[PDB]
């Protein structure tokens, strides 16, 4: 009764954290690519 609630809570927390980490990694890759492309083109 009591432990399954926190079980599901931790599972959904881990899922959301993994999704957010993948999103942030994609954002970092995109911004690094944009910055390096701008630096190469301008300079």
């Amino acid at each position: 009764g009591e432990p399954q609630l926190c079980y599901i809570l931790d599972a959904v927390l881990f899922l959301y954290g993994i999704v957010l980490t993948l999103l942030y990694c994609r954002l970092k890759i995109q911004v690094r690519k944009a910055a390096i492309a701008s630096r190469e083109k301008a300079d």
């Binding site: 993994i18 990694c25 995109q30």
Partner: protein, 160 residues
């Protein structure tokens, strides 16, 4: 040009995803081996943590992701084939890991069916923890397998 133009960022994104998945798998393996590797608990419940699968898979994933990341910077124009081969073998590694994961999942389901009072002793509690780890590792391995298959098909398309 669909994936031919989409790959420029997807390759790096999936390489980073592979690195992250390998890191989490290594952390899980280290934690379980340090804590949950006592002789009191049975061996069938810890099917994954008996043949060295977590450490080997984490090492393979880390190596493949690092090679992919280095190759994405166009280093010596040679690491493309090495990364392709590493991810090709990582596909089989992930398939074997999925088979081990489903075997451990059904074994833990049988053990939980044997349990009646829901974690009435140490054995049922560690079985529940092991099946939570099994679900988490199954999700991570599905993500890693998708990353590996995408990278392999992209590199096959490039090398043709």
């Amino acid at each position: 040009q669909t994936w031919r133009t989409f790959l420029k960022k997807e390759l790096e994104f999936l390489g980073a995803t592979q690195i992250l998945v390998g890191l989490i798998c290594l952390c899980f393996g280290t934690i379980v081996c340090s804590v949950l590797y006592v002789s009191d608990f049975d061996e069938e419940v810890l099917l994954l943590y008996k043949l060295g699968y977590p450490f080997w898979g984490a090492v393979l994933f880390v190596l493949s992701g690092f090679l992919s990341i280095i190759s994405e910077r166009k280093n010596t124009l040679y690491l493309v084939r090495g990364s392709l081969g590493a991810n090709i073998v990582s596909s089989i590694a992930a398939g074997t890991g999925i088979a081990m994961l489903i075997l451990n999942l059904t074994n833990n389901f049988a053990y939980m069916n044997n349990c009646k009072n829901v974690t009435e002793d140490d054995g049922c509690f560690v079985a529940s923890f092991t099946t939570e780890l099994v679900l988490m590792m199954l999700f991570l391995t599905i993500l890693a397998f998708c990353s590996a298959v995408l990278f392999t098909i992209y590199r096959i398309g490039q090398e043709l």
